[PDB]
Design a protein around this ligand. Structure first.
Ligand SMILES: O=c1cc(CO)occ1O
Ligand SMILES: O=c1cc(CO)occ1O
Ligand SMILES: [Cu+2]
Ligand SMILES: [Cu+2]
Ligand SMILES: [Cu+2]
Ligand SMILES: [Cu+2]
Lengths: 286, 287
């Protein structure tokens, strides 16, 4: 009974109220908690030595961010019980000749691309320099949100609808050894390591700026719209393959199994395995 | 009130073995590293950004943050053995000894001894010596062995004394503005050890050395938890003495420091842990 809408379906009042709430959460000090949580989990390797971490590059990538978004939406509701977390359906923006012309980058919502005169500092929209302070990898101020759409040779474009459809065909949620090299794995496909960077990883590299590296990515509010779409694609996968379940169920690295606590919380993947039990739904499901 | 935390020197040889056993299990399962990471992450979480205050140190939440830290750690201990509690290292009595390194807490059956200067002060005795206990660095990667170097600093050659503890218990205010290292007439800042620092809590970290000598890696040494168990005991004694003093600030402090603000990286507030008896544990001196 909580509907999360496509960004392009939002009214100008819904767009304004969401932007308003994020700014309030930022002013109170709640927003920075989520930046720090995401950076801390990126450093928590499972197990130490491997390149698996609690939030990425392993089987917990999807449930971790679902819990991440769940906690964020609850904090949104503390200020306004009418604001939900919209999702950025970037696979349809990619259909455009110039995806940077999408209304999600308008001055009334997320703001536009970075200014190459000012080292790609974003100077338009509610999160422009002077209105929205960022923190660096070390937790100290860094002086402004940056973006540089499609300025990389490994991610010049946004993922397509065909990329999403081909990932939904995968039968297994994940496969051993539950990491960057997992083949025939929906998790690793959606994450974007199969001929990477694609999908989730490509979207981060396409936006650039803080969004292009793990420890600083949540500095951009579009991080939450991005992962709201990733969580939707996962929820669609769970509906299609109704008789598949999370993997691994056991004997994976600690923090990756079905009932292990996900650092930095005690929440397990099972606790968030059914998003309707969490109290929200995506508009395409109705 | 139904769970007693004993002085380390009062433990039986069976209690010492079970505690060491449980900690090793928590390390093997992967739970122990969660506390290293939690402590490092909170040390980087400045409140507010720019200021010299973090969620776990250098401000009013220092004491309740570590109490919740110890509470969560003790619960994980009970999941493996529902009869093991968190003992405390009463370092104010070890300081009375001429050489505190001769204390039974550093025996091969418990914490092990001082570092070996031949091996760059790697600890080579006890259950946590190199080869039986792997450590992680500030970045979350293995670092290859616990180090200790007792009293090797010019600013903290000795352990704090009994008189240091008594003089801290005299302070009337829990904390004072601006709720940080410069707070004067503050029990919290006094106990932390920034009044003519390093003293008390801060001095103990500097005296042990090794990983214990810097914030992000300190929990790599299991004595980190025994140390803070004693800090939590002294606070609980202060709360009993000054029964009508309360946490400060109650409001209009930096977010994360007020009585009902969530303490990163949890949602726990200082009020949630303000009464340690309600949390389910008690110190043996209270009996
Ligand atoms: O912040 C991130 C950036 C990238 C780019 O690969 O991937 C994953 C992230 O969480
Ligand atoms: O973990 C810590 C390490 C040091 C070293 O001085 O001081 C204070 C701490 O809380
Ligand atoms: Cu992430
Ligand atoms: Cu991401
Ligand atoms: Cu600490
Ligand atoms: Cu300490």
């Amino acid at each position: 009974y909580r509907v999360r809408k496509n960004v392009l379906h939002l009214t100008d009042t819904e767009k304004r109220d969401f932007v308003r709430t994020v700014l309030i959460l930022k002013e109170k000090g709640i927003y920075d908690r989520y930046i720090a949580w995401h950076g801390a989990a990126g450093k928590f390797h499972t197990p130490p030595g491997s390149d698996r971490n609690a939030a990425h590059m392993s089987s917990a990538f999807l449930p971790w961010h679902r819990e991440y978004l769940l906690r964020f939406e609850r904090d949104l509701q503390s200020i306004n019980p009418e604001v939900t977390l919209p999702y950025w359906e970037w696979e349809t923006d990619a259909q455009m000749q110039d995806p940077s012309q999408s209304q999600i980058w308008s001055a009334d919502f997320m703001g536009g691309n970075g200014n190459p005169i000012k080292d790609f500092i974003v100077d338009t929209g509610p999160f422009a320099a002077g209105r929205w302070t960022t923190i660096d990898e070390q937790g100290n101020p860094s002086g402004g949100l940056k973006r540089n759409f499609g300025a990389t040779k490994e991610a010049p474009t946004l993922p397509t609808r065909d990329d999403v459809l081909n990932a939904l065909k995968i039968t297994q949620y994940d496969t051993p050894p539950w990491d960057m090299t997992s083949q025939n794995s929906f998790r690793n496909q959606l994450e974007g390591f199969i001929n990477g960077p694609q999908l989730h990883n490509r979207v981060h590299r396409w936006v650039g700026g803080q969004m292009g590296v793990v420890p600083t990515a949540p500095n951009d509010p579009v991080f939450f719209l991005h992962h709201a779409n990733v969580d939707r694609i996962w929820a669609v996968w769970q509906i299609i393959h109704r008789n598949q379940n999370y993997q691994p169920m056991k004997n994976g690295p600690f923090g990756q199994n079905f009932r292990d606590p996900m650092y930095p919380w005690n929440t397990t993947p099972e606790d968030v395995m059914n998003h309707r039990k969490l109290g929200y739904v995506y508009d395409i499901e109705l």
